[PDB]
Amino acid sequence: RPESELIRQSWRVVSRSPLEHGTVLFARLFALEPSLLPLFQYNGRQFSSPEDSLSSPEFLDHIRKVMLVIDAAVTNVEDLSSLEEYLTSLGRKHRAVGVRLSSFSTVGESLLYMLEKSLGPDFTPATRTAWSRLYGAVVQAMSRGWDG
Template identity: 35%
Template sequence: MVKELNYTTITHVMESWESMKRTKNYETVAGSKLFRRLFDKCPQSKTLFGFPIDIDVDSPELLNSKRFLAHAVYLLEMIDTALNMLGPDIELLTDIMTELGKKHVSYGVKPDMFPIMGDALIYMLRDVLGDEFTDATEEAWKETYGALSADMIRSMVSK
């Protein structure tokens, strides 16, 4: 559960996220790296975002698509919102993740897509942050993403 995250974990995640936000055009840069990796590892997820399943992940059509970037930015903004709520608003955040999980069922998202999204997130962070992305930071992200997605998945399977 999100509630179980400790102070050190949250600090690592917050600091690395702030560092990433100092990257020029971070939302577009990070968002396209994240989704390119997700679509590469989980082709069926392309259809959930309105792309044909056989579209090449490197095709200009996909990488220059406004829809692709809009979704990428959207998801990153959500993670940003979630991180800002990790402190005092943790109870509310858990409720929001539960509701969000139920909505994801209607989008056609399957529980087994969550770890693939998590791997894509780590891949993107390592790529953008380079040496700043230490083992401790990686662990903290895995724990945080794991906790957020666990709340969502729990509500998806108990529907």
């Protein structure tokens, strides 16, 4: 697929520095939707502000987790059923911690935001469409996790 190659190529530089990039993605996410901030709780405490999340080892480690799973999706772009069971299991864990399917779109926009800002003129229309379809396939796999 030419499309799988657009994804792989655009992901290369991001994957070289996954935390700095996931940091953009989550900074965006909490700028768009600060009501997601209390979902991330460690030691029991609640992050008061988005910048508080960026000081938390548990939260930074969470970011690297997320970026590893997107990397996995990229690795498997050509099939992506090879990941479906993992992703459905990921979906279940989300439903169990109280996330709602409606939040998926804001995360997708945060991802696409981070990619546009990283790539600039290399984030071609074709690249964006490819990413939107990949993210949508990942979401559709995870959504199963809300099946029961």
